[PDB]
Design brief:
Keywords: trehalulose synthase, sucrose isomerase, alpha-amylase family, (beta/alpha)8 barrel, Isomerase
PDB class: isomerase
CATH topology of the largest domain: TIM Barrel
Assembly: monomeric
Structural class: alpha/beta
Helix content: 25-40%
Distance between the termini: 27 Å
Number of helices: 17
Largest sheet: 8 strands, parallel
Name: Sucrose isomerase
Strand order of the largest sheet: 11-10-9-5-2-1-13-12
Entry title: Crystal structure of the trehalulose synthase MutB from Pseudomonas mesoacidophila MX-45
Bound molecules: calcium ion
């Protein structure tokens, strides 16, 4: 047969709010994204995944939807959305929208009705329960602060919200609710959308009776929330009633789920989702409280990739990303963002990103080498999640304001949300007004305009890597094999398909290193290298690597 277009595609994630503003209000919009399609096309992007673009009070920047069938006021009108669609099509590009159906805004008409009374027709579109022993129904904690249960004096019961208090969870146990969600998905799919990314898709099913989480589960409640007994039953139904009638690719954000359960979501034979967004890697050095970091090495990094790949099997498929809107900047996180190493390590990570088995997603700005932001006070963060950490850890006396700042500065989601750096004009050319989130001062050195015309820029390297990937089947659908899972210095692996085998060698140390190819393996040709003074001689049996050097070679 043949592999789907999404298995050989290179996606680009656009956070509209911080991509390109065109009316000076400081917030990115659709016209802004539409004006930059030539930029993405030139980069070689095949499809774009945009974060939530629906009507929202923005307590969680788009993830709290008040109307699934209207566009967010800040981004434009439905017409603007249609225009984005048409322009993407004119360039042969596809659009993947974000689907947020684990919860809705508390301003959604379903919730407004739901809270009116216990006998209301929409009561069960959400989860309402009586408190217990004078307190909340159970000990469920919220990702964004305090209890996952909020009492509503209108009825006296508590409603469930894994996330923000203004993000009540939708009740998937209710048939009419599921039917409404399916009809909503068809609304967008009928418009031609080519893909859907499902926000926290593993938390749709809630545990019957809502018993308390054990002390252990409390430590990792995110995992417990992914163990609903009707989860896959619901996913199979959605696929049967919706996706079976369209030709769109589905990608689930399987956050919190044990890696061993991932196959249940993506094995094609199961008819659930097409691709998986896993977080074992991107959160591989994150503490359980989600705001502290834990030192890891390349060995942990590669081994995690190892496991995630193995999980895909023969019928599953992974997406591969080193960054997104919920995590610190790739180069700062996995590379070395210091001035002398930023560019070298950003290129090294690009090589990794574009040579991994699965569908790679490039997060806006990483192709430029953008870094974390130099937060100075807690007021510099906008993220509701940080306010949650303050409520749960500072106001409770567990940590000082300074300790939260020091640590959250390295992990905060806002690191990835600062305005895209287009050029060195006012606010990096992002807006003519005041950006909703301050632009990183390093935009004077790191910006698209400066990198586009420079053959040695991080941008040009990405572009070239993307062309190489597009021209080399093995680099997308080829098998993957880690040459040495225990090596904590140089990441080396092969990609093979129909006889053609390629070698990827990336030095993760800011020091010279050597690499000996597996016995019998020799270099045939060098497709590309970064930070390398010279390609290896044809027939080479080993490689001498410069600090943070990366390379792709066809072997024999
Ligand atoms: Ca705007």
């Amino acid at each position: 047969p043949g592999a789907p277009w999404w298995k050989s595609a290179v996606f680009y994630q656009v956070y509209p709010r911080s991509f390109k503003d065109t009316n000076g209000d400081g917030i990115g919009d659709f016209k802004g994204l539409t004006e930059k399609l030539d930029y993405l096309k030139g980069l070689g992007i095949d499809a774009i995944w945009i974060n939530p673009h629906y009507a929202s009070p923005n307590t969680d920047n788009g993830y709290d939807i008040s109307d699934y069938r209207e566009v967010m006021k800040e981004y434009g009108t439905m017409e603007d959305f249609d225009r984005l669609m048409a322009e993407l099509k004119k360039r042969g590009m596809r659009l993947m929208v974000d689907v947020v159906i684990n919860h809705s805004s508390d301003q959604h008409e379903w919730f407004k009705s739901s809270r009116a009374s216990k006998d209301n027709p929409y009561r069960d579109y959400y989860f309402w329960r009586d408190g217990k022993d004078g307190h909340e129904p159970n000990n469920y904690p919220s990702f964004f602060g305090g209890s996952a249960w909020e009492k509503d004096p209108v009825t006296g019961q508590y409603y469930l919200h894994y996330f923000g208090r203004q993000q009540p969870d939708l009740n998937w146990d209710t048939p009419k609710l599921r039917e409404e969600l399916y009809a909503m998905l068809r609304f967008w799919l009928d418009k031609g959308v080519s893909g859907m990314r499902f926000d926290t898709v593993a938390t749709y099913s809630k545990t019957p009776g809502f018993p308390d989480l054990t002390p252990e589960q409390m430590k990792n409640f995110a995992e417990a929330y992914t163990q609903g007994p009707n989860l896959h039953r619901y996913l199979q139904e959605m696929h049967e009633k919706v996706f079976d009638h369209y030709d769109a690719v589905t990608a689930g954000e399987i956050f919190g789920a044990p890696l061993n359960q991932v196959p249940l979501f993506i094995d094609s034979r199961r008819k659930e989702l097409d691709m998986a967004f896993t977080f074992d890697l991107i959160r591989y050095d994150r503490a359980l409280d989600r705001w502290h970091t834990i030192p890891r090495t390349l060995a942990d990094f590669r081994q995690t990739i190892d496991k995630v790949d193995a999980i895909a099997g023969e019928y599953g498929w992974n997406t591969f990303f080193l960054g997104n809107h919920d995590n610190p900047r790739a180069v700062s996180h996995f590379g070395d963002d210091r001035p002398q190493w930023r560019e070298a390590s950003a290129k090294a990570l690009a090589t990794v990103t574009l040579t991994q088995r699965g569908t790679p997603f490039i997060f806006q700005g990483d192709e430029l080498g953008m870094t974390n932001y130099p937060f100075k006070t807690l007021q510099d963060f906008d993220d509701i999640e940080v306010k949650g950490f303050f409520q749960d850890y500072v106001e409770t006396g567990k940590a000082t304001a300074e300790e939260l700042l020091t640590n959250v500065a390295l992990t905060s989601r806002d690191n990835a949300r600062t305005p895209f750096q287009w050029d060195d004009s006012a606010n990096a050319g992002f807006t003519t007004g005041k950006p909703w989130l301050k632009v990183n001062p390093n935009y004077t050195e790191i910006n698209a305009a400066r990198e586009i015309g420079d053959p040695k820029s991080v941008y040009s390297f990405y572009r070239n890597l993307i062309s190489i990937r597009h021209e080399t089947p093995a680099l997308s659908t080829g098998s993957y094999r880690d040459i040495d899972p225990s090596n904590a210095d140089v990441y080396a692996y092969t990609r093979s398909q129909d006889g053609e085998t390629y070698l990827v060698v990336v030095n993760f140390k800011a020091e010279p290193r050597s690499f000996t190819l597996p016995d019998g393996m020799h270099i045939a040709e060098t497709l590309i290298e970064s930070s390398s003074p010279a390609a290896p001689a044809a027939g080479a049996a080993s490689l001498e690597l410069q600090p943070w050097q990366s390379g792709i070679y066809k072997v024999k």
